[PDB]
Amino acid sequence: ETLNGGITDMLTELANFEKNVSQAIHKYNAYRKAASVIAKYPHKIKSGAEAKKLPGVGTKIAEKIDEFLATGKLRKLEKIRQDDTSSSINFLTRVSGIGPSAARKFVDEGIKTLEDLRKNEDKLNHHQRIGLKYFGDFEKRIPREEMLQMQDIVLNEVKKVDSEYIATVCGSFRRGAESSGDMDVLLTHPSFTSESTKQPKLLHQVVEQLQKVHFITDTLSKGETKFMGVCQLPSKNDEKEYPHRRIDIRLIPKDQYYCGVLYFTGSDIFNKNMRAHALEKGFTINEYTIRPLGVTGVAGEPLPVDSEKDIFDYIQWKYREPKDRSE
DNA sequence: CATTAGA
DNA sequence: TCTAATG
Ligand code: NA
Ligand code: NA
Secondary structure (H helix, E strand, C coil), X not given: CCCCHHHHHHHHHHHHHHHHCCCCHHHXXXXXXXXXXXXXXXXXXXXXXXXXXXXXXXXXXXXXXXXXXXXXXXXXXXXXXXXXXXXXXHHXXXXXXXXXXXHHHHHHCCCCCHHHHHHCHHHCCHHHHHHHHCHHHHHCCEEHHHHHHHHHHHHXXXXXXXXXXXXXXXXXXXXXXXXXXXXXXXXXXXXXXXXXXXXXXXXXXXXXXXXXXXXXXXXEEECCXXXXXXXXXXXXXXXXXXXXXXXXXXXXXXXXXXXXXHHHHCCXXXXXXXXXXXXXXXXXXXXXXXXXXXXCCCCCCCCCCCCHHHHHHHCCCCCCCCCCCCC
């Protein structure tokens, strides 16, 4: 956590570079397994060799540690940090829509700056044009203050459109968090659960609403179960316009909300724990159900859930508020 | 790890 | 169809 840090930290620098700038899926994969195990390791790595004894710990990497352990840095680490090209790839990646594959393609073309992206707005597909559009707004954080008014609106429509609709803004926001990165509404409805052959509209209906009224400005993507957009709070009585925010809405079977909702709330850690705990208490939990364990090694059979509670009671825990889903 | 774009 | 990109 702090004894192995620079080491794991430098490791991940390396990894993330292999995978992004280069297409070394493997090396990249290498640095990370290492970056992992050395992290577990309870003692201060004193040298290459000491490390080397570790699993996934090669000589290539061990070599890396010496230099790092010896001089406060790393040449390649220094060498990569500089490189406009790799530098350039690191940045374009930031534009919503741009992954590395594209990132690289763009570069080779000689698109390295934000402006390049501009002059060549033509080479970008919708997602990316939008990304490019709201570059400042997507990188900006979401105040709970705003989070509150936001949430406020999305509920009223939902409600207004149909009243049988259940919404839930999961995420950090849901867990207290003074700020969030993007709003995430969970969506269900009774007429939609597991077997019932869809009702895409269910999704569509709302998106229409939210748009109708001007909350959803743009669309990144809309499927019959996952809509991926952009929102905006009605700039009051002028002077103050609101930032463009990422909003994502997804349809769920009534019969799988709670686990799902459980899930999306986190924290990434609480889930595990909770998830690790269920294991003992005779269960399994995942993004959708909770199936009682059978000694033969494994087992199925989705137990029924009507609230966050059910999942809880099931595995025999204390209902932990979202506020407290911290870990 | 799954859903959507797009080519 | 595959292949990227997001969460
Ligand atoms: Na991006
Ligand atoms: Na292949």
